Ligand binder design. Sequence first.
Ligand SMILES: OC[C@H]1O[C@@H]2O[C@H]3[C@H](O)[C@@H](O)[C@@H](O[C@H]4[C@H](O)[C@@H](O)[C@@H](O[C@H]5[C@H](O)[C@@H](O)[C@@H](O[C@H]6[C@H](O)[C@@H](O)[C@@H](O[C@H]7[C@H](O)[C@@H](O)[C@@H](O[C@H]8[C@H](O)[C@@H](O)[C@@H](O[C@H]1[C@H](O)[C@H]2O)O[C@@H]8CO)O[C@@H]7CO)O[C@@H]6CO)O[C@@H]5CO)O[C@@H]4CO)O[C@@H]3CO
Ligand SMILES: OC[C@H]1O[C@@H]2O[C@H]3[C@H](O)[C@@H](O)[C@@H](O[C@H]4[C@H](O)[C@@H](O)[C@@H](O[C@H]5[C@H](O)[C@@H](O)[C@@H](O[C@H]6[C@H](O)[C@@H](O)[C@@H](O[C@H]7[C@H](O)[C@@H](O)[C@@H](O[C@H]8[C@H](O)[C@@H](O)[C@@H](O[C@H]1[C@H](O)[C@H]2O)O[C@@H]8CO)O[C@@H]7CO)O[C@@H]6CO)O[C@@H]5CO)O[C@@H]4CO)O[C@@H]3CO
Length: 108
Amino acid sequence: CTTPTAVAVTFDLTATTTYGENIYLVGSISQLGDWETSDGIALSADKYTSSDPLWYVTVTLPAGESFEYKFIRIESDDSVEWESDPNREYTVPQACGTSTATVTDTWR
Ligand SMILES: OC[C@H]1O[C@@H]2O[C@H]3[C@H](O)[C@@H](O)[C@@H](O[C@H]4[C@H](O)[C@@H](O)[C@@H](O[C@H]5[C@H](O)[C@@H](O)[C@@H](O[C@H]6[C@H](O)[C@@H](O)[C@@H](O[C@H]7[C@H](O)[C@@H](O)[C@@H](O[C@H]8[C@H](O)[C@@H](O)[C@@H](O[C@H]1[C@H](O)[C@H]2O)O[C@@H]8CO)O[C@@H]7CO)O[C@@H]6CO)O[C@@H]5CO)O[C@@H]4CO)O[C@@H]3CO
Ligand SMILES: OC[C@H]1O[C@@H]2O[C@H]3[C@H](O)[C@@H](O)[C@@H](O[C@H]4[C@H](O)[C@@H](O)[C@@H](O[C@H]5[C@H](O)[C@@H](O)[C@@H](O[C@H]6[C@H](O)[C@@H](O)[C@@H](O[C@H]7[C@H](O)[C@@H](O)[C@@H](O[C@H]8[C@H](O)[C@@H](O)[C@@H](O[C@H]1[C@H](O)[C@H]2O)O[C@@H]8CO)O[C@@H]7CO)O[C@@H]6CO)O[C@@H]5CO)O[C@@H]4CO)O[C@@H]3CO
């Protein structure tokens, strides 16, 4: 059993946008570049604006262990305000199940 090795997690975040920007999910994982949004988890507006006013998301992480989950909110001024105030710890278990959960939050 090694087919399901990714982690589909749905994240959401109420922080409004401006048809141009991205609110991400940088969690500490090899594919979740928590410390380089280049591989965290961006959120956008498929229904909302073009950028992302409700900041929703559904990405997959190829891993199965403890992962840090810091959040970063990239604005339209090209500048990530790595929301590092709060914090999350997705312990994705390496099994045939329990490899996809939620990850909701919001901006203060
Ligand atoms: O990848 C695993 C790596 O993650 C952690 O280490 C640090 C991580 O690399 C940093 O990114 C940091 O989080 C930063 C985050 O990216 C942004 O919020 C950032 O703010 C912006 C700034 O404009 C600027 O900081 C920059 O961010 C970084 C660049 O993306 C990057 O190119 C870097 O340039 C190099 C560094 O000069 C060099 O020191 C190198 O460091 C390595 C470490 O020695 C190694 O331990 C490893 O650590 C792991 C570990 O799991 C976590 O601690 O990280 C490096 C890989 O070996 O990193 C670059 C190598 O090319 O310049 C800055 C660094 O500040 O751009 C962002 C927006 O784009 O600031 C955050 C600062 O925390 O998390 C940790 C350090 O806190
Ligand atoms: O502060 C105002 C708020 O909105 C600002 O601009 C919005 C404006 O509506 C447009 O500029 C649009 O931008 C484009 C984008 O590609 C799509 O939105 C697109 O689609 C339109 C179509 O006509 C159709 O899809 C239809 O469907 C929408 C509904 O009409 C509408 O009810 C919507 O509901 C959500 C809205 O998208 C928006 O209000 C959303 O955000 C609210 C939050 O309170 C907060 O984020 C903030 O957001 C700003 C935003 O950053 C600005 O850019 O206030 C919003 C409240 O006003 O939450 C609503 C919850 O129901 O649902 C569907 C979306 O699929 O209408 C849409 C838009 O009318 O239109 C444009 C190009 O076609 O969206 C931006 C982004 O909100």
